[PDB]
Design a protein around this ligand. Structure first.
Ligand SMILES: Cc1ccc2cc(C(=O)O)[nH]c2c1
Length: 167
């Protein structure tokens, strides 16, 4: 049994809810929240900008030190950093950004990072300002992630379309 409330069950392991991931993290304090990161961990906008704002920029400060030591992530890659006030850990995952022309086949690689964690609160990778089709992102998630994933979808309209169209 876990803390997550109000989710619709899509599969054995994937759950979905219309929710602000920031407000959901603040309530649940999950072991892992996933950030929709870029390779530079520059948390300017979208989910990343919202998570970082909720940490009062501490996520960005920590991320800048990580990049200064390790260099950029790979598209499809990830790193584990602090969850600050939102979670124990933040798994920063880089999905391909279609608005940069990145290979959408890297979306499966991005979701494979979730399998290193038994339970996660996450957004749909490559959705929103990363430009991919969220319906496609949900399908890759279901077909890739085997651990227990609780997906937060900010937009109610999109939430209803994802559920109605789910096979
Ligand atoms: C967006 C949203 C807001 C409130 C709730 C409450 C639930 C629940 O108890 O099932 N789900 C929600 C989804």
């Amino acid at each position: 049994v876990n803390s997550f409330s109000g989710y619709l069950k899509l599969t054995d392991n994937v759950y979905i809810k219309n929710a602000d991931i920031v407000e959901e993290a603040k309530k649940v304090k999950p072991t892992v929240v996933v950030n929709a990161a870029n390779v530079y961990l520059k948390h300017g906008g979208g989910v990343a900008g919202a998570l970082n704002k909720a940490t009062n920029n501490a996520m960005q400060v920590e991320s800048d030190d990580y990049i200064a030591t390790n260099g950029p992530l790979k598209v499809g890659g990830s790193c584990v950093l602090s969850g600050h006030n939102l979670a124990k850990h933040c798994l920063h995952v880089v999905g391909p950004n279609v608005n940069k022309g990145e290979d959408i086949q890297l979306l499966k690689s991005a979701y494979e990072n979730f399998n290193q964690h038994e339970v996660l609160l996450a957004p749909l990778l490559s959705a929103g300002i990363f430009g991919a089709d969220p319906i496609h992102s949900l399908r890759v998630c279901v077909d890739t992630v085997r651990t227990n994933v609780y997906l937060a979808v900010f937009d109610k309209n999109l939430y209803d379309k994802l559920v109605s169209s789910f096979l």
